[PDB]
Enzyme design. Structure first.
Site, short mmCIF file in Angstrom:
data_model
loop_
_atom_site.label_atom_id
_atom_site.label_comp_id
_atom_site.label_asym_id
_atom_site.label_seq_id
_atom_site.Cartn_x
_atom_site.Cartn_y
_atom_site.Cartn_z
CG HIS A 60 -118.96 -9.94 -92.67
ND1 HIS A 60 -118.77 -11.10 -92.26
CD2 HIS A 60 -117.67 -9.30 -92.98
CE1 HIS A 60 -117.60 -11.04 -91.77
NE2 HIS A 60 -116.94 -10.06 -92.32
CD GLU A 113 -121.71 -13.53 -92.00
OE1 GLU A 113 -123.07 -13.46 -91.62
OE2 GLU A 113 -121.05 -12.64 -92.42
N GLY A 123 -108.87 -8.65 -90.80
CA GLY A 123 -108.19 -8.99 -91.75
C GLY A 123 -108.10 -10.50 -91.82
CB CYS A 151 -113.28 -11.92 -92.15
SG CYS A 151 -113.85 -11.69 -90.56
#
Length: 181
Positions: free
Chosen positions: A41, A72, A146, A148
């Site tokens: 992402h 992901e 924050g 990730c």
């Protein structure tokens, strides 16, 4: 404070950079040579900022499992003048549960942050921001915007990167040795 934090610190000091895309600032784990990982992402493009240095992306691959399900993880090769310390021997070979994990973040917003998240469950399937995702690890910590790309470690193993939360639990994508052969 103890051997959990000692291993985590050793990974953060030599194997992380601050990555900036159009979608924000992320902890980015360097794995070997010029190869690093970031949550898919982050939407990596042709150019990324690495510790505020304009950097060409030589290759980027959003991993999916053989059911064509999102994992992901994006693997990025950076046009950088310096190699990462090779940490592939600290990656697990198989999907597993873990005790006593640390989530470590390094950004402009959260410098030198280490969170003892405790027991890690092999959760498997998660609907992550609307996207069916596999190989998710779960821990019982109220993680926030924050974190990730934050690195999940145990003493001796680098086991995942933080990709989301629901306010009470946090979720990481597994790192497996087979991704980096």
């Amino acid at each position: 404070m103890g051997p959990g934090f000692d291993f985590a610190q050793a990974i953060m000091k030599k194997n992380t950079v601050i990555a900036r895309t159009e979608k924000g600032e992320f902890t980015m784990l360097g794995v070997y040579d010029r190869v690093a990982v970031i949550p898919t992402h982050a939407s990596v493009g042709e150019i990324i900022y690495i510790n505020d240095v304009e950097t060409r992306v030589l290759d980027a691959c959003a991993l999916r499992d053989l059911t064509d399900t999102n994992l992901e993880i994006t693997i990025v090769k950076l046009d950088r003048n310096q190699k990462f310390r090779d940490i592939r021997h600290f990656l697990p070979r198989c999907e597993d549960d873990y005790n006593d994990a640390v989530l470590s973040v390094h950004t402009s917003k959260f410098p030198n942050m280490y969170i003892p998240v405790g027991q890690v469950t092999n959760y498997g399937f998660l609907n992550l921001g609307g996207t069916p995702t596999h190989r998710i690890l779960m821990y019982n910590f109220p993680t926030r915007a924050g974190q990730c790309g934050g690195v999940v470690t145990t003493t001796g193993k680098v086991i995942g990167i933080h990709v989301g939360g629901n306010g009470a639990q946090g979720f990481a994508a597994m790192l497996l040795h087979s991704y980096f052969t």
